[PDB]
């Protein structure tokens, strides 16, 4: 069941907007940049960031989709700044899988990672470059990220089964 | 003599814009917020942030100005979120004085600090909540912050003498 | 009611030992340093630190006791690196009162901050230089630090009515 | 030219000792922990950390060696806390290669990374869990790590043409 809300629609909107500005700032423009969404909600987050960047800089950013699932759609990559987008950073194992998939498709100038929430408990020396919000959790708790495009609403909560 | 430019006009713009978004985000809105610029350059930086915030939230924010030297433009304080604004965070000593002044005027809910650049070398346990850019410097180097309103251009550089 | 135990005697012991090494490391030896314990329990932590450092460096370190009650023990301050020692870093207002109290005694070369736990919720631009453990908490939760010298046991827990 | 010495023998000594306590501290001991050094100097730093951890816990930590050139030696992996050890963390591409190598030999409980120096300029979403010293650098500077076992002396410096 749901224990508590840690991000409402407004907090998610402001977080994603501030991230877009962070991406633009740390790359001095989105030139050579590419957003690649993971799983399902990461893709929707990626598309939102692309629109925000486009809205801010006037330049559009390519959005690609990556389907990990196993290994535990095409796009630029080569000599590009590949920014992975995902909803929650946990153990970090998915990112590793995602990185292999990126360099299996080319050689990027670099790979970055943007997540809506970092809930800690990393099991790999991996960190997000951009973070919507750091949400302290116990190892057993569950982070549920709901996005309007798939869940009907924007909300991040902590659950416990 | 100018040793190196660490922030050009565009970098300063993207930093101040991102900071404005960080400010609204952590405060979940502008309500109760008060920007207090510190003598000279910190004042202009507070004005620029106040404008960016207004542009973002559709509502303006109270902007006061603090002359730390004079302490040896009034504004709200009590139960307010006072965001001190300065150009460079250095030893941190100047910030303590700024805190004493703010609380001389009232009892704020919180005091925050935003600086364009944090050049390290603190001599007190004070850290900025918002930082335009962290600029490592030696103990002998000088940080020169130029703002268009006073120096004709927006630029941050490292000087040696 | 006790909601959780976040540090047992072994964790506390290992955090304190590691901090002693961090203190020596960041100051390139303990020459000119002074450990000033705050309130009540910060005094014991400072004593344990002084003892650990002594056994590591083979050189003793001055220990003072500061009561910050008035700001909310004849020890060296001026020209010294005053390392404040407290049990918990919360809003940081205790630190501001402590910095004021230290400035009424002398002119330190610099002031640092070491705490056993940082539970977040800062209301001032203050951060510890050394932290035993970051214990995320809700605003309504209480951090209880028990030390053998005063409570019969070493333990840090989270309480809430 | 050697334009700056960032770590001398004593600093390295105190940094490694501090790292050992941190490692033990975050793992609540070393039970199930394995140290794995890469390239050449990482191996030496791993042996040292291993030596330091023995004097603290009274038990040896397995030490493995990893040759990465073929990615761009025994030790248990599965269910173990594998601690990668390298001298410098730069782009982080070596670490990604090192990780693939680790999970090629098994399924560890977690993989952590310890490095003597972090010089920034990450090109992958990788971070070290234990850092001897963060040394800011320009893109054209080079980090040279000298260890007595191979270079006759312990020293970290910044070089530039």
UniProtKB/Swiss-Prot annotation, chains A, B, C, D:
Substrate binds at residues 40-41, 86-94, 119. It is an enzyme of class 2 (transferase). Keywords: Glycosyltransferase, RNA-binding, Transcription, Transcription regulation, Transcription termination, Transferase. It catalyses: UMP + diphosphate = 5-phospho-alpha-D-ribose 1-diphosphate + uracil. Its EC number is 2.4.2.9. Pfam families: Pribosyltran (PF00156). SUPFAM superfamilies: PRTase-like. A motif (PRPP-binding) lies at residues 82-94. One of its GO terms (molecular function) is RNA binding. One of its GO terms (biological process) is DNA-templated transcription termination. InterPro entries: PRibTrfase_dom (IPR000836), PRTase-like (IPR029057), PyrR (IPR023050), PyrR_bifunctional (IPR050137). The keyword Transport does not apply. Homodimer and homohexamer; in equilibrium. Regulates transcriptional attenuation of the pyrimidine nucleotide (pyr) operon by binding in a uridine-dependent manner to specific sites on pyr mRNA. This disrupts an antiterminator hairpin in the RNA and favors formation of a downstream transcription terminator, leading to a reduced expression of downstream genes. Belongs to the purine/pyrimidine phosphoribosyltransferase family. PyrR subfamily. This is Bifunctional protein PyrR. It comes from Bacillus caldolyticus.
């Amino acid at each position: 069941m749901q224990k508590a809300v840690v991000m409402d629609e407004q907090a998610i909107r402001r977080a994603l907007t501030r991230i877009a500005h962070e991406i633009i700032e740390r790359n001095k423009g989105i030139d050579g940049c590419v957003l690649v969404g993971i799983k399902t909600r990461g893709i929707y987050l990626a598309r939102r960031l692309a629109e925000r960047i486009e809205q801010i800089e006037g330049a559009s950013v390519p959005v690609g989709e990556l389907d990990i699932t196993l290994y535990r759609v095409p796009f630029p990559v080569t000599e590009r700044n590949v920014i992975l987008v995902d909803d929650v950073l946990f153990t970090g194992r998915t990112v590793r899988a995602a990185m292999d998939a990126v360099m299996d498709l080319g050689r990027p100038a670099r790979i970055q990672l943007a997540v809506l929430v970092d809930r800690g408990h990393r099991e790999l020396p991996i960190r997000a470059d951009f973070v919507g919000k750091n949400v302290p959790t116990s190892r057993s708790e569950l982070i549920v990220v709901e996005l309007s495009e798939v869940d009907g609403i924007d909300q991040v909560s902590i659950h416990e089964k």
